[PDB]
Amino acid sequence: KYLLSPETIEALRKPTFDVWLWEPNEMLSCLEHMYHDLGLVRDFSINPVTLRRWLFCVHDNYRNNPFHNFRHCFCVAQMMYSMVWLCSLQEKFSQTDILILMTAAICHDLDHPGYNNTYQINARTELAVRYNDISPLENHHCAVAFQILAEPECNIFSNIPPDGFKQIRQGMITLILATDMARHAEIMDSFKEKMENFDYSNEEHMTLLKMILIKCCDISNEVRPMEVAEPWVDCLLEEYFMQSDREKSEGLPVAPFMDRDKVTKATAQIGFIKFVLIPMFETVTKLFPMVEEIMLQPLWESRDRYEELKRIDDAMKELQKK
Amino acid sequence: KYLLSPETIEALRKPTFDVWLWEPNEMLSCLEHMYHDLGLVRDFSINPVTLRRWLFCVHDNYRNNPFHNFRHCFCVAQMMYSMVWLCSLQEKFSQTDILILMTAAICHDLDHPGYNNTYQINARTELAVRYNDISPLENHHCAVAFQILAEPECNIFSNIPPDGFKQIRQGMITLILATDMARHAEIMDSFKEKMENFDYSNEEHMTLLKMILIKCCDISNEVRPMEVAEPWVDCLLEEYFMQSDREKSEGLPVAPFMDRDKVTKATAQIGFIKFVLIPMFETVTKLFPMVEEIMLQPLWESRDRYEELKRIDDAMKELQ
Ligand SMILES: COc1ccc(NC(=O)[C@@H](C)Nc2nc(=O)c3cnn(C4CCCC4)c3[nH]2)cc1
Ligand SMILES: COc1ccc(NC(=O)[C@@H](C)Nc2nc(=O)c3cnn(C4CCCC4)c3[nH]2)cc1
Ligand SMILES: [Mg+2]
Ligand SMILES: [Mg+2]
Ligand SMILES: [Zn+2]
Ligand SMILES: [Zn+2]
């Protein structure tokens, strides 16, 4: 099982990579390859043995949730990796920025519990109390990421000078905190503002672009081939129901899109695709045209397919009406 | 002792109150009085007994630092109390806002370790790593505040509907997080921006004002009579120097303004009074003119005194 075939290693570079075919060790090997392949091990003097141990801690710090598990972690990092090639991001970003994008992608959901921020806050959990209701999950993911890096045996940054560490740390924090969907509209507005006259030499412009990139990868499941993308919806709804169930037997509010009685696989995706994914990737296409064909296309197909599924679903519902 | 006298109860409403005369149990009694006096106990159905246990928990959660200790906590709240009367804040703010201001003031520095954010961040402390370098101390103060309020025996908000709690919690977090001096100019800029045409109806305007109010009380030591204020400068430097020593000892960056070899009592206060205190109180005076005579005058006087103490210091150094 261990040892990636050259076929796999080449497939790893595209958004068509079948993320379900592999097990922890294989995905870990793939992640390891990405760091070597992108020139990060080289340019940052990353002890290659430390790189593997680090990946092991990361994996150990992910929970067995239906959706927010290590495989999701792998999907986001693999999609980021695909973006780097598709958009030749190495022509626009320094290696440090590439390191930040990949590492934040891998760490962005560390120790996720399976219940979102709205639950944390409403249920006044320890995390919501610790972070004063401000992106409790994302703040936690960052903290865990750096508690891991604080451990010598897992410190892939041990050979980077202090100034570079601070720059990397700051960049990662910004990107991980940017994955909080509550800030989606805000961040999209900020990006579309800079978008009027984007400037690659403008640090603030690049910061927003990196935020949009990790955001894109985080919710990119529907960009993948239908057979690869569809099973994720079930995983998502499983986790969502696990929460709405709890919020119900606790008297806490319940979100409709998480309601076991109102949400279907299709209605869970149609809106998300039309008003979240497509708009975001469209803006990104204004910067990278190749994105439209490789990523906006599968999104359009997915949207149409789900709208058809919804009609069959509505038909069955009509037959259940009394 | 813990039974405040009529004289004490009346003096407690002015910024001239001598905070050094009382012991913790007496200060606790004073704080307790403030909640009854302001109508917070009535209007929020605070169980009087719970109010006492809570204050005891707050007190227990402050550390014995030379500056950031329970007495600092008391000064800020006592100054906020003074302000409510001086500016007639109950005419401008709801009882919920008064509650937010008073409770935030009391909890704003909970469990402060005696070393600022720069130290937490540079030493990569547990707190800095937990808060991702974002106002680690203030975030912590706020977390402890609600960890205490989470305990049923200390929950002074136990009889407040959920919607009220949320509005209060959000308010306190905003105010406690606003006490990070790294954000001083930023907050002053936003406030002054609103001040171009202040609107008591505008919630965003009122949020900034509350932020400025708590900020004023937090660094209001020099507004107090010279005899009350003077001792604080020594507590301030003691704490500051404890940090710079440690930083030197651990090979960490040292901030000149906290450096034991460069800071004198006069240089510590002059700039602070002239560029932080006065400008901030000047803007507030625009909304509350009575503040000029009660808080600015003491400031101008302290400024002039410390400026003189400086010329004397320089002449003494020069003489050698
Ligand atoms: C605007 O903030 C939002 C936060 C969560 C959602 N969730 C959805 O709309 C649900 C019903 N559908 C959905 N489809 C996806 O493929 C997908 C991928 N990620 N996510 C979620 C984004 C938050 C974490 C999981 C998805 N949600 C939608 C919007
Ligand atoms: C602009 O933000 C700043 C933050 C801290 C300082 N500190 C100082 O200037 C020191 C030397 N003097 C000073 N005098 C005071 O009466 C006073 C009261 N509080 N503080 C500090 C405010 C931050 C916490 C302690 C004071 N600092 C100066 C400026
Ligand atoms: Mg997340
Ligand atoms: Mg403080
Ligand atoms: Zn994620
Ligand atoms: Zn303070």
Q: Does B169 touch chain A (CB under 8 A)?
A: yes
The token pair at A250 is 């606790």
- Given a contact cutoff of 8 angstroms between Cβ atoms, the answer to whether A116 and A137 are in contact is yes
B131 CB neighbours in chain A (<8 A) are 131, 139, 143
Domain range enclosing A236: 1-322
Measured in residues, chain A has a length of: 322
**Residue B278: how many other CB atoms lie within 10 Å:** 17
Non-local CB neighbours of B298 within 8 Å, separated by 6+ positions: B15, B222, B223, B224, B225, B226
The token pair at B70 is 């329970």
According to the annotation, is B59 in a ligand binding site? no
Q: Does B165 touch chain A (CB under 8 A)?
A: no
Whether residues B133 and A177 touch (CB distance < 8 A) is answered with no
Cα gap A175→A208, rounded to integer Å:
9
Non-local CB neighbours of A186 within 8 Å, separated by 6+ positions: none
A139 CB neighbours in chain B (<8 A) are 131-132
Burial B48-70 (b: 16+ CB within 10 A, else e): eebbbbbbebbbebbeebbbbbb
Active site residue B68: yes
Q: Is B217's C-beta closer than 6 angstroms to any atom of ligand 2? A: no
Cα gap B320→B307, rounded to integer Å:
20
Burial B242-277 (b: 16+ CB within 10 A, else e): bbbeebeeeebebeeebbeeebebbbbbbebbeebb
Inter-CA distances, B241 with A252, B118, B135, B221, B266, Å = 49, 14, 21, 19, 15
Cα gap B220→B83, rounded to integer Å:
11
Cα gap B140→B173, rounded to integer Å:
10
Ordered DSSP codes for A6-33: HHHHHHTTSTT--GGG--HHHHHHHHHH
- Given a contact cutoff of 8 angstroms between Cβ atoms, the answer to whether A214 and A173 are in contact is no
The ligand with the least distance to the CA atom of B239 is 2
Q: At what angle do helices A265-272 and A226-248 cross, to 10 degrees?
A: 110
Residue nearest to atom 11 of ligand 2 (CA): B268
- Given a contact cutoff of 8 angstroms between Cβ atoms, the answer to whether A29 and A4 are in contact is yes
Cα gap B217→B86, rounded to integer Å:
13
Instruction: Name the strand (E) or helix (H) holding A166.
Output: helix A162-177
Q: Does A147 touch chain B (CB under 8 A)?
A: yes
Cα gap B196→B320, rounded to integer Å:
51
Atom nearest to B221 CA in ligand 2: 16
Non-local CB neighbours of A108 within 8 Å, separated by 6+ positions: A73, A76, A138, A141, A175, A176, A179, A214, A218
Cα gap A172→B129, rounded to integer Å:
13
Way the structure was solved: X-ray
Non-local CB neighbours of A94 within 8 Å, separated by 6+ positions: none
Whether residues A146 and B132 touch (CB distance < 8 A) is answered with yes
Whether residues A173 and B132 touch (CB distance < 8 A) is answered with yes
SS3 of residue B121 by DSSP: helix
The nearest CA of chain B is from the CA of A126 a distance in Å of 9
Domain count, chain A: 1
The token pair at B216 is 């004023």
| Probe target for ligand 1 pocket from A223, A228, A272, with the most ligand atoms within 8 Å of CB | A272
Residue nearest to atom 26 of ligand 2 (CA): B219
| Probe target for ligand 2 pocket from B76, B236, B264, B299, with the most ligand atoms within 8 Å of CB | B236
Amino acid at A253: P
Whether residues B129 and A146 touch (CB distance < 8 A) is answered with yes
Provide the terminal-to-terminal Cα distance of chain A, rounded to the nearest Å. 54
According to the annotation, is B112 in a ligand binding site? no
Cα dihedral sign for A134, A137, A141, A144? positive
According to the annotation, is B180 in a ligand binding site? no
Non-local CB neighbours of B193 within 8 Å, separated by 6+ positions: none
Residue of chain B nearest A138, judged by CA positions = B132
Instruction: Name the strand (E) or helix (H) holding A64.
Output: none
Cα gap A299→A273, rounded to integer Å:
7
Cα gap A135→A183, rounded to integer Å:
9
Q: Is B257's C-beta closer than 6 angstroms to any atom of ligand 2? A: yes
Amino acid at A29: S
Cα gap A213→A280, rounded to integer Å:
10
Q: CATH number, domain at A264? A: 1.10.1300.10
Burial of A180 (0-12, 13-18, 19+ CB in 10 A): buried
Ordered DSSP codes for B237-287: HHHHHHHHHHHHHTT----GGG-TTT--HHHHHHHHIIIIIHHHHHHHHHH
Cα gap A77→A83, rounded to integer Å:
10
Ordered DSSP codes for chain B: --S--HHHHHHTTSTT--TTS--HHHHHHHHHHHHHHTTHHHHHT--HHHHHHHHHHHHHTS---SSSSHHHHHHHHHHHHHHHHHTTHHHHS-HHHHHHHHHHHHHTTTT--SS-HHHHHHTT-HHHHHTTTSSHHHHHHHHHHHHHHHSGGG-TTTTS-HHHHHHHHHHHHHHHHTT-GGGHHHHHHHHHHHHTT--TT-HHHHHHHHHHHHHHHHTGGGGS-HHHHHHHHHHHHHHHHHHHHHHHHTT----GGG-TTT--HHHHHHHHIIIIIHHHHHHHHHH-THHIIIIIHHHHHHHHHHHHHHHHHHHHHHT-
Cα gap B115→B124, rounded to integer Å:
13
Whether residues A139 and B131 touch (CB distance < 8 A) is answered with yes
Nearest to B221, CA basis, from B295, B307, B113, B283? B295
According to the annotation, is B108 in a ligand binding site? yes
Whether residues A124 and B150 touch (CB distance < 8 A) is answered with yes
> How many A from CA of A66 to the centre of ligand 1?
14
Residue nearest to atom 7 of ligand 2 (CA): B272
On the CB side of A235, how many CA atoms lie within 13 Å of its CA? Answer: 17
Nearest to A137, CA basis, from A151, A121, A150? A121
The token pair at B297 is 């005058």
According to the annotation, is A71 in a ligand binding site? yes
Q: Residues of B numbered 21-40 whose beta carbons fall under 8 angstroms of chain A's beta carbons: which are they?
A: none
Cα gap A25→B260, rounded to integer Å:
55
Cα gap A232→B183, rounded to integer Å:
42
Nearest to B149, CA basis, from B140, B157, B160? B157
- Given a contact cutoff of 8 angstroms between Cβ atoms, the answer to whether B303 and B270 are in contact is yes
Angle formed at CA A123 by CA A120 and CA A126, multiple of 5 degrees: 60
Cα gap B92→B106, rounded to integer Å:
21
